[PDB]
Amino acid sequence: PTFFLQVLRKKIDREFKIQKALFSVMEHVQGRIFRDFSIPGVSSAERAAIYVSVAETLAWLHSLGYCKRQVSTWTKQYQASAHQSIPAMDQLSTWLMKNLPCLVHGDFKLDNIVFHPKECRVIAVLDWELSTHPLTDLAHLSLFYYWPRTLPMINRGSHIPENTGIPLMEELISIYCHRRGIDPNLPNWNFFMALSFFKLAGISQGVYRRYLMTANTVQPLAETGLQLSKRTLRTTPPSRRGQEVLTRVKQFMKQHVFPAEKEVAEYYAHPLVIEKLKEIAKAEGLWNLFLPAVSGLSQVDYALIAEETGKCFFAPDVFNCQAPDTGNMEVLHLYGSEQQKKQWLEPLLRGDITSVFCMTCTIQRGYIVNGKKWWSSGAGNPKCKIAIVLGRRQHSMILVPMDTPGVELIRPLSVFGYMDNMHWEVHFNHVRVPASNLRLGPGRIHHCMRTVGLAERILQIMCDRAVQRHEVVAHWIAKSRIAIEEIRLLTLKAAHSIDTLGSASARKEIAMIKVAAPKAVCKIADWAIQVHGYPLANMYAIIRTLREVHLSAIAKMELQDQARRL
Amino acid sequence: PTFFLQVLRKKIDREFKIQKALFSVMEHVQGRIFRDFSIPGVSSAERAAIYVSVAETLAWLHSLGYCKRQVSTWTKQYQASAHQSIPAMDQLSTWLMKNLPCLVHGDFKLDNIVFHPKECRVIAVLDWELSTHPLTDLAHLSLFYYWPRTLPMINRGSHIPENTGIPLMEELISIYCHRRGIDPNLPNWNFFMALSFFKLAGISQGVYRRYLMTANTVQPLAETGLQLSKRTLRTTPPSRRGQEVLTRVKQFMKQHVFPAEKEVAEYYAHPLVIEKLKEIAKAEGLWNLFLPAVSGLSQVDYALIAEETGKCFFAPDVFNCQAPDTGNMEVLHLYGSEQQKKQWLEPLLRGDITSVFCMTCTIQRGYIVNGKKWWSSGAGNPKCKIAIVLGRRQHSMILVPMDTPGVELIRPLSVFGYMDNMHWEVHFNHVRVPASNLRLGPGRIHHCMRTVGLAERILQIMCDRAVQRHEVVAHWIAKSRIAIEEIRLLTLKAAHSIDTLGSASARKEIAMIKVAAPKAVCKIADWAIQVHGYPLANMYAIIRTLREVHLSAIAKMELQDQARRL
Numbered sequence A, B: 001p002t003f004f005l006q007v008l009r010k011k012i013d014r015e016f017k018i019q020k021a022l023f024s025v026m027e028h029v030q031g032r033i034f035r036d037f038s039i040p041g042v043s044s045a046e047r048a049a050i051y052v053s054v055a056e057t058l059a060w061l062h063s064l065g066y067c068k069r070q071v072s073t074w075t076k077q078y079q080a081s082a083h084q085s086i087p088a089m090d091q092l093s094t095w096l097m098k099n100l101p102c103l104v105h106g107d108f109k110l111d112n113i114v115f116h117p118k119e120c121r122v123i124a125v126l127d128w129e130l131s132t133h134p135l136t137d138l139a140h141l142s143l144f145y146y147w148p149r150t151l152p153m154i155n156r157g158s159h160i161p162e163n164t165g166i167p168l169m170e171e172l173i174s175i176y177c178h179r180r181g182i183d184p185n186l187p188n189w190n191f192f193m194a195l196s197f198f199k200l201a202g203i204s205q206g207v208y209r210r211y212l213m214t215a216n217t218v219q220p221l222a223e224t225g226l227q228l229s230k231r232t233l234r235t236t237p238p239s240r241r242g243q244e245v246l247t248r249v250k251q252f253m254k255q256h257v258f259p260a261e262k263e264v265a266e267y268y269a270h271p272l273v274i275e276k277l278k279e280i281a282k283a284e285g286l287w288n289l290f291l292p293a294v295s296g297l298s299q300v301d302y303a304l305i306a307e308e309t310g311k312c313f314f315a316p317d318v319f320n321c322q323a324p325d326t327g328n329m330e331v332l333h334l335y336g337s338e339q340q341k342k343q344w345l346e347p348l349l350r351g352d353i354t355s356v357f358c359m360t361c362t363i364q365r366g367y368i369v370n371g372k373k374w375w376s377s378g379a380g381n382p383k384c385k386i387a388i389v390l391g392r393r394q395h396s397m398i399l400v401p402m403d404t405p406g407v408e409l410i411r412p413l414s415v416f417g418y419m420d421n422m423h424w425e426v427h428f429n430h431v432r433v434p435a436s437n438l439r440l441g442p443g444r445i446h447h448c449m450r451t452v453g454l455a456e457r458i459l460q461i462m463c464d465r466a467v468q469r470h471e472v473v474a475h476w477i478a479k480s481r482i483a484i485e486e487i488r489l490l491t492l493k494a495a496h497s498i499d500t501l502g503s504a505s506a507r508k509e510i511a512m513i514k515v516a517a518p519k520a521v522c523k524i525a526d527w528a529i530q531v532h533g534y535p536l537a538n539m540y541a542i543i544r545t546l547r548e549v550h551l552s553a554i555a556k557m558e559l560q561d562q563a564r565r566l
């Protein structure tokens, strides 16, 4: 007898004994239960007080080596209760079995605590079912910070916000430790995260199996557990997610991709080296970053990462953030048909096929699209299947597969005598496509950040050459640094304006960064090649290829703003 | 019997009755007592939890019209116990007497609460002496946010930090109100602040008088109470101090100083209008802003305010933030002899005398300073007495009063034929001065922010003239806007770098803003005067007067940074 009543008397014997001991037949508790773990119904100070209170009640209930046995039992239960193939689960179990290390609550979450009706203090704790290590429960509580950005959150809640009032993981860890007495640093933390994620995956699989007599969430959980199983999680105190991702990006870059620059350049005059690097980056978790949902970071962190990966010429290819593909990916994901999404994006997010965005025709109503394209970047790749054309309120963009009859590449276009193997013309002669086959802010931001990174590398090279081999060169260096700093500041300001105050109130800054950057970057490239009297050739080629209506647009917007202000 | 024991049994009868009723002879309480109200011994979440807990214990002890009589009694007690002349106290009492509107604790502060030894929860509340309105106690608790930036904090603590973890005043107000049930908005809040400040001043005066049988703190408290007695304090929820100061600056500007522009310009070809405006600004509290201790704001708020007050040509004169005076004031305040400070700064902070910083000689050891100055700005003012000269590690700056024998102005220097009534040469022929009479970051930041504001006003004027009367003018407008945005971003970045990561790690950005701004601002002025084919004459004069070694310095620093990075 433990069901609801209008609680009950309530291995129920173990739970009853635990309740009796704690008191040294529980009735109803008149308190709240935050289903969503983001706590959106209170202020910031209230959220911080709530999390401090749960930390201290955990400490008070804890402070007042069969862990491997528990891991083995959970592995056996998950393997016996499994109903679908899951190599990730077996890999995670094998990896955790290679790692070794009281009265816990088993499933201590924010959803199993009833507070006071008018005050933020813990009144009672329930659901003490799987109770039998003084640090595993803390890891189970704190794992929700690393809930995968792709998997929807459990208990119908939003992902944990940052800079809102919630304590960061290190902050909560320090609170609990100082409440207990142990040192802030903790050992075998990767093992704790792996065990917690594996236990959660097993619980979800068991719940799904019981409901059959949650199902698709075991694979993302196992993948994330494997991803965090090989890292250095600093328990002691030290967006934060953006900084961690940027640090990992820099480490991966400096450890793998810079030494391959010479080999790639020699092969230029896609190699299997790029394929191996792509596989390594996908395995390490650094893949499809630029997608604003598969990675979860904010716009400013995106711009900083793009700046960090614009230095190498072919760097965006490794992270699957090429120039044409990302716009089509964003268009498909944001406002796209579910059937069209399943048909097309699945061949993009896995890197199966490329894409192309072309507007440099007739889209008259099925519908027929007869016209001639031009300057279509990335149209010559052997793995280029999809194609998005926004041709003639005549703006109607419709997908057109390149394998459809009537599509035929005409000739390759050369810029300054470089074929750009890493601009073939396209002709569409009355292609028949079904009706099923039928913004710029992030694109401009990333296209400016990459150019800024390129200019920074150019300045580094020019400074090194000037030192290795007068006042004029020093003046050139100083002017280049000034221009680089100003352009970076403008780009970051535009990105932050897009992030905070919507996306429709940042057209002015986008036009401004579209105007400012290329001129100064071309000037810097010219000064560098003049000082030289080498990778700089590729940088100059890119800067010249990437090189006055936007000034008129900015003037119109400025005049409108001045008229509005008065 | 209420003294300490190793508490006691403990109008003590009223306190004993209150304790007995609350329980329905208190012993010692084993808990902490935060003397400093900033709570520096805990983390951010712990601070937020502490303040939430004090808010809810206040609400629980309160929720579970003799206010004018109490005000009159406090006024009588303060007047009878007064020992020194205080017109501010009488003025505040008269102002409060014109404003009209349970079981309180009288002196409910963070210093009269004992928490738990290991948890952040309220255990007991003490010092219930003056207990007899359900909102006055809240105002007394929350007044500590407006502790004057000049008066040192009480109970030997630091001023309340921002963006640290402490709740903002509106946030705490909302917490307490939602705990009680009243609406977030509150009436007669200015009266509450005035009464709270007057009561605190009376308590301090009484404590000082009792100790004589705190003394100098009654005047700043009364002045601050008078200053906040005339404002609009929004109780409901809506740096914050920087934003409030900037809003007040903009309101004062647009309400008083812009209409006087025509009169001042006509008088040009200091008037009593400037004196009246200076008196009004000093009365309103907007005075000596640029001093980094008499105002208390951070560097970024300082730059934003300076940008807002750089638009009017003579605006810095009203706020007492002139170009030469502020450097000498900062040098005196930061590292200056107490005797020298009392001798000189007191004639500056009150606007009694001006100053001048001149280095464009011999300071050989008393000491004699014989040499010829040049381009000494502000040396012709009739109220110019002090003078700081850093002349010949020969850098030894020594104050030299201008009334001393041997100092005589030579001739006035004209720039472009403007005498600049709002540059006389100085000659020092063996001045005898005692040995008693013996950085650039804020100066450069403000000197760039004012120029940015001037450029913004110039662009506004040029846009208005272009509308009132082609593609080239539109292109000019767009380029001017781009340059203005880039320069503002650079200036703010340099100011923030000075603020956060010390003042010795921002020389590069300071040199960068010293290089970048004048060229673009001069170009904008040239384009404006070309479009015109008027206040713009004064703006061009200033921009030209304010107009290549810094490039070499920046190149040297950049080369050193590149060498260090490798």
Ligand SMILES: Cc1cc2nc3c(=O)[nH]c(=O)nc-3n(C[C@H](O)[C@H](O)[C@H](O)COP(=O)(O)OP(=O)(O)OC[C@H]3O[C@@H](n4cnc5c(N)ncnc54)[C@H](O)[C@@H]3O)c2cc1C
Pocket: A357, A358, A359, A360, A374, A375, A376, A377, A415, A545, A546, A548, A549, B471
């Ligand atoms: C490296 C590279 C990659 C490219 N990739 C792509 C791609 O992926 N997809 C794609 O669709 N296109 C692509 N393009 C083409 C790109 O769209 C063109 O550079 C651009 O659209 C101009 O094409 P256009 O010949 O129509 O310009 P035109 O209209 O022929 O050029 C007119 C020029 O005159 C000037 N001008 C315009 N209006 C005014 C005015 N009112 N007053 C004064 N001057 C004015 C401007 O300088 C303007 O560029 C690429 C080009 C390059 C060089």
Ligand SMILES: Cc1cc2nc3c(=O)[nH]c(=O)nc-3n(C[C@H](O)[C@H](O)[C@H](O)COP(=O)(O)OP(=O)(O)OC[C@H]3O[C@@H](n4cnc5c(N)ncnc54)[C@H](O)[C@@H]3O)c2cc1C
Pocket: A471, B357, B358, B359, B360, B374, B375, B376, B377, B415, B545, B546, B548, B549
């Ligand atoms: C409006 C105004 C207000 C002023 N107010 C003050 C004031 O309050 N206090 C004060 O002390 N002074 C003041 N001055 C003077 C100011 O210090 C001077 O403008 C400046 O110091 C230059 O003086 P100078 O004659 O010694 O320069 P000079 O040394 O005679 O000029 C040399 C010039 O050559 C160039 N140059 C220098 N080194 C190099 C190099 N290595 N390579 C190439 N070119 C180089 C630079 O353009 C430099 O300005 C003011 C000036 C003006 C115009």
